[PDB]
Structures are given as structure tokens and as C-alpha cells.
Amino acid sequence: MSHTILLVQPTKRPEGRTYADYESVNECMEGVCKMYEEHLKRMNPNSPSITYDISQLFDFIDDLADLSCLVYRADTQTYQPYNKDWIKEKIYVLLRRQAQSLKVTILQSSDSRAFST
Amino acid sequence: HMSHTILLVQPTKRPEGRTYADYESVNECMEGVCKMYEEHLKRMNPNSPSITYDISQLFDFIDDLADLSCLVYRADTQTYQPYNKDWIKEKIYVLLRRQAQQAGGSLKVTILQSSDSRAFSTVPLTPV
């Protein structure tokens, strides 16, 4: 549970550079998936449940122009930098733990998640 | 110092306006804030070849910002160090004074809409 800032450059256009912050690494990592999930929720609005492989999640991330995060360390009172591929792993670790090839299904009816293998 | 610096901006309370830029050094990030205020003037005054602001005008415009922080890389820990709005304003106060030096009371900055470089002029007392 540490303050986490996320640097998102979606397209090569630098005016897209944006950021959000979260109370922990976890809801930052969930913040990324919720960015991809809102993208699928918007692509398929009439779909009640949208399923995606975790590879299409990483595919979306890979296509982002830039993604990085900054995690607070109370002992030094700074922010540690981790790059995109790091973030993808924490999302892999987060979604894998959430379940118990990974397949996530986006149940819009509940703003919740479900999994498969 | 001259380490990688990230600038976190937020003009209005509306978070969709959040953005960031990064710079090779702290001093190039501080100029980025000045240039952020400057171009806001140049766009407001497209018919004035030059515009001059007091440094305190640069500080009010920064208070208006919903949020403005910056992060400075630190090799000893390999981490980015946070700095709030006050720190940035003081760093700008110091940097522009040294830049005016090499060229109450307060400082006036004169920029040409053509250029990014600054011309400085010191003022006897500070405004109301």
C-alpha cells in the first residue's frame, strides 16, 4: 500500500501524455486493466460479457506509446520507477491471483471480473 | 541537479487535463514551467511582439494550477524525488535571478513571441 503514479502516453502525439495516481500498486495495476476493459466495453457496448485473453491485454499495453509507474518508498520517501514490461508482469501476477493461458471476461452488469483456463 | 526530471501538471480540477513532460535537468524543467506560463501569455496577446511579466505573475498563475509537482532522479537510490508547488516556485525564483544576474523588490521577464530566450529587468518594489 504505497502511493503510485502512472505515466500514460497513449499515442506518439506527446499531447496525449497523461497520468493518474492510486493508493497502492494494486489499484494502479487494476487501473491499467480498467483502461483496457473500458476500451473493450466501449468497442462492444451491446455485449453483456466481453472476454479477452491476457495476451490481448499485453497487446494493448505494447501498443501504448509509453507506460510507466512510480511507486512510493516510505524509507527513502521517493518514487521508484518501473517500466512497461514490469507493469505487465504485475498485471499478470494480479490477474492470476484474482482467478484463484488466462482468460478474463468483463461482466459489465456488475463491474466485476471472471476467469478461465 | 542535472538528472532526469518529470513534471506533473494539472491546470483545472478536471483531471482529464492532467499531463506530464520530462527534462534532462531540474533547470530545464523549471524553464518548462516558465514557458508553460509564457506561451499562455503569447496566446493571450498574439498582437504584442514582446510580453513582460513580473515574476510574481508567474507565481500567481502557478497557484491557479490545480496541481503542479515534479520528480527528480537521484542516482544514489535510483529513485525519483518528489517536490511540491512551493519548491518549484523557489527554484524558478532562484534560476531566473541567476539568469538575470548573468545579463521587497522583484524581477520582470521580457520574452519575444519569436524566441524562447529571456531578457530580464529588476524592479524596485513588489506589486500590490
Largest interface, Cβ cutoff 8 Å? A-B, 16 and 16 residues
Give the structural class of chain A: alpha+beta
Strand order of the largest sheet of chain A: 2-1-4-5
* Total tally of structural domains of chain A: 1
Judging from the principal axes of the Cα atoms, what is the shape of chain A? globular
Major sheet attributes of chain A: 4 strands, antiparallel
Please, how many helices of chain A? 3
Task: Please explain how this structure is put together.
The PDB classes it as protein binding. The entry lists the keywords ERH, CIZ1, protein binding. The assembly is dimeric. The entry is titled "Structure of CIZ1 bound ERH". The structure is a homodimer. Chain A is of the alpha+beta class. Chain A has one domain. Helix content of chain A is 38%, strand content 33%. Chain A contains 3 helices and 7 strands, in the order ββαβαββαββ. Chain A has a 4-stranded antiparallel β-sheet with strand order 2-1-4-5. In chain A, strands 3-6-7 form a 3-stranded antiparallel β-sheet. The longest helix of chain A is centred in the N-terminal third of the chain and has 19 residues. Chains A and B meet through β2 and β5 of A and β2 and β5 of B.
